[PDB]
Amino acid sequence: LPTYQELEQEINTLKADNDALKIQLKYAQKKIESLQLEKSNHVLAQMEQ
Amino acid sequence: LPTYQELEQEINTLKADNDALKIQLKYAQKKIESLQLEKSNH
């Protein structure tokens, strides 16, 4: 069986994977919005009211 | 302190969350590519 310490290390790895996927997902969603806005000659940063 | 069982539980939850994020990211990447293809045609 894996050691309790190994399980701890695995959790640390999986949390890091989680953090990376979340930031990449936000980045990808912003890119989708940017491409949609490009169709109308606008950029994401100009849309803040 | 977390019991060894509760660590196993947390590992399964994290794997599930990570698998769900990978699916959402893949769909986001497909939409980006689709939009780039549309742009190049337009």
Residue numbers in the entry:
A (entry chain A): 745 to 793
B (entry chain B): 745 to 786
Paper text:
Residues 747–789 within the C-terminal region are predicted by the COILS webserver to contain a coiled coil and are spanned by the RasGRP1CC construct. We determined the crystal structure of RasGRP1CC at 1.6 Å resolution. Two molecules in the asymmetric unit of the crystal form a parallel, dimeric coiled coil of nearly 10 helical turns that is structurally similar to canonical coiled coil proteins such as GCN4. Leucine and isoleucine residues stabilize the dimer, and a pair of glutamine residues in the core maintains the proper sequence register between the two helices. Two pairs of ionic interactions (Glu 754-Lys 759′ and Glu 782-Lys 783′, where the primes refer to the second subunit in the dimer) further stabilize the dimer. The structure of the C-terminal coiled coil demonstrates that a second dimerization interface is present in RasGRP1. Consistent with this structure, RasGRP1CC is exclusively dimeric in solution from 30 μM to 1.5 mM monomer, based on multiangle light scattering measurements (data not shown). The fact that the C-terminal coiled coil is parallel and dimeric is consistent with an ability to readily connect with the autoinhibited catalytic module and reinforce formation of the C1-mediated dimer. Because coiled coil formation is independent of the C1-mediated interface, RasGRP1 is likely to remain dimeric upon disruption of the C1-mediated dimer by membrane binding. Dimerization in this way is expected to enhance the affinity of RasGRP1 for the membrane by allowing the dimer to engage two Ras molecules simultaneously.
